[PDB]
Structure to design on (154 residues):
């Protein structure tokens, strides 16, 4: 969260 | 906040990345979230789209016409676009307002139409699915589940 899968 | 997504909603986001990768795209945009919601095929978002005549093929055709593919499929992590970030942020509030403590597929679809401006919204409108009509269809289906 919130830039890539799953961050 | 992804800890609050349901299993299926997480699968939609994971699948959106691969929708982008397989089209030789280098960002995960709102249109890949739309492809993922349909292609996953089981949740309230997929049912709502199918029930409005929005098919995976219709969306694919519009994405090729609007965006087009790159030359090679990237490896590694593909970043969300600014508009895809806003859709995922908005999904949190759609869920809370509808009385849900978890973010389900339908809340991602509701986030997408709330954002209302990116490639997915353009595709939906072009395919004859006005944003308000989509929201009301989600509400209609969720109301049926209260029976």
């Amino acid at each position: 969260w919130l830039a890539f899968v799953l961050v | 906040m992804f800890e609050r997504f349901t299993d299926r909603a997480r699968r939609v986001v994971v699948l959106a990345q691969e929708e982008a990768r397989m089209l030789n795209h280098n960002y995960i945009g709102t249109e890949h979230i739309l492809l993922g919601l349909i292609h996953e095929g089981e949740g309230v978002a997929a049912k709502s789209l199918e029930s409005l005549g929005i098919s995976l093929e219709g969306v694919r055709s519009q994405v090729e016409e609007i965006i087009g593919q790159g030359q090679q499929a990237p490896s590694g992590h593909i970043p969300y676009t600014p508009r895809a970030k806003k859709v995922l942020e908005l999904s949190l509030r759609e869920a809370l307002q509808l009385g849900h403590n978890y973010i389900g597929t339908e809340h991602i679809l509701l986030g997408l139409i709330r954002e209302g401006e990116g490639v997915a919204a353009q595709v939906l409108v072009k395919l004859g699915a006005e944003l308000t009509r989509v929201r009301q269809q989600v509400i209609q289906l969720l109301s049926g589940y209260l029976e």
The interface with chain B takes residues 1-6 of chain A (CB under 8 Å). Chain A has no helices and no strands.
